[PDB]
């Protein structure tokens, strides 16, 4: 169960040359041991491209041995009786080897056979989870997506809470993996209550990831409570450096300590965002998005501020602040201007009946267009 997810999570780090060259070569040790032990040989060939014949001779041997054993065993099983349960169990076991070697193709054949045959509802759900897990190993979004739909057909028939925890978290990784964080936060905070490590990245990872998503999604009170008043995160302390950085960030956002906000922002980038396979792609949007949320927050409470004041609080020069503010303003989240010659920062205040007016017409505009498009269509008939 454990090697299935661990091989891929560890190997990622080595791949990256984003990381320091020194860090990159330490990862190499761990990854290398598990290539040979688990015989990852077809896939390994792929993976050497991206950065002893014995491994592979071993593969041929192991393969042949294992094959030969189980072959005539399954040929004997056919002569013999029970095809529902016992042959299905063996067919699962062929797939287990296939999943060991990194061919997604060959596991999917055998494990389908099990489903075909009439089995326990509990048993059904199980088998479909494993098929979808094979997608994570490579990290493909399209394959994962389609498999997890089926799982929901059987999920309430079995009605187990045991495997629905596994289901919640699988869909979580699919979401994390893509840019959208809204969905992830909702499943991954829940996994704090109940986690199962089975074919799933360890609980400590889930603690860190839950916290990142947390920040991005919930508004003040709610979000704060979810990412702080959680008993679980306090009990777990700061046991690894990465979980520390993110929590430090959370403290500073909430506490409105804006001097330490910026140091904490930089740490989270180096040690949270990049180790993460999922948020590697999304590093760019994430870190930038935080500078905007935090700035908005300070401005909300202030009619006006000075540039010199604002600048000082964060720990950047006055010039730097201005430049970085001029990015945020037309995009619009800050809702602000800078009256430059005076050096004051004004915050436009249309929060009222005017606000509600403007929003409401735009939403009306959206309904108006759809009606036309549909109208015109039917009208031709």
């Amino acid at each position: 169960r454990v090697p299935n997810y661990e091989v891929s999570e560890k190997a990622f780090l080595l791949t990256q040359s984003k990381v320091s060259i020194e860090q990159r070569k330490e990862a190499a040790e761990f990854v290398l041991a598990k290539i040979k032990e688990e015989e990852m040989a077809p896939y390994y060939k792929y993976l050497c491209e991206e950065y002893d014949q014995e491994l592979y001779n071993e593969l041929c041997k192991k393969n042949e041995s294992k094959i030969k054993e189980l072959n005539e065993k399954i040929q004997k099983l056919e002569e013999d009786d029970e095809g529902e349960l016992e042959q299905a169990q063996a067919w699962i076991n062929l797939g287990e080897y296939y999943a060991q070697i990194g061919d997604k193709d060959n596991a999917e054949k055998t494990l389908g056979k099990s489903l075909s045959k009439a089995i326990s509802t509990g048993a059904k759900i199980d088998v479909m989870l494993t098929i979808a897990r094979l997608g994570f190993f490579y990290n493909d979004q399209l394959y994962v997506k389609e498999k997890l739909e089926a799982v929901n057909s059987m999920i309430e028939k079995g009605g187990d809470w045991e495997r629905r925890n596994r289901y919640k978290t699988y869909y979580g990784i699919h979401c994390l993996a893509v840019r959208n964080f809204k969905e992830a936060a909702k499943l991954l905070v829940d996994s704090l209550a109940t986690f199962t490590s089975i074919e799933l990245t360890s609980y400590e990872s889930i603690a860190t990831y839950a916290s990142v998503t947390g920040l991005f999604t919930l508004e003040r009170t709610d979000l704060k409570s979810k990412v702080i008043d959680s008993p679980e995160l306090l009990s777990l302390i700061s046991t690894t450096a990465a979980l520390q950085s993110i929590s430090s960030l959370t403290i500073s956002l909430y506490a409105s300590d804006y001097a330490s906000y910026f140091p904490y922002l930089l740490e989270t980038y180096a040690n949270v965002l990049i180790p993460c396979k999922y948020l590697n792609r999304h590093a760019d949007f994430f870190v930038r998005e935080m500078r905007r949320k935090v700035y908005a927050q300070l401005l909300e409470s202030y009619k006006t501020l000075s540039l010199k004041s604002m600048a000082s609080a964060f720990g950047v020069s006055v010039a730097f602040l201005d430049n970085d503010l001029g990015k945020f303003i037309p995009n619009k989240q800050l809702n602000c201007v800078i009256d430059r010659v005076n050096g004051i920062v004004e915050t436009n205040r249309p929060d009222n009946k005017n606000a509600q007016y403007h929003l409401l017409v735009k939403q009306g505009d959206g309904l108006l267009t759809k009606l036309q498009k549909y109208g015109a269509a039917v009208r031709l008939t």
Binding site: L265, V287, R288, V316
Partner: protein, 51 residues
């Protein structure tokens, strides 16, 4: 078979399809701002602190 007359008539007014003519003949830009920010934070800091 009715709609078909029209589809062919439109294509002809275009001439071929340009669509395939082009390959034969031949804030998403925003850099990670983390790298630049690192430099900014540090220079301001040095002076601020030892002022």
């Amino acid at each position: 078979t009715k709609k078909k007359n029209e589809e062919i008539n439109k294509k002809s007014l275009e001439e071929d399809d340009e669509f395939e003519d082009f390959p034969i003949d031949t804030d998403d830009v925003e850099v990670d701002d983390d790298f630049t920010n690192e430099l900014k934070a540090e220079l301001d800091r040095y002076k601020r602190e030892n002022q």
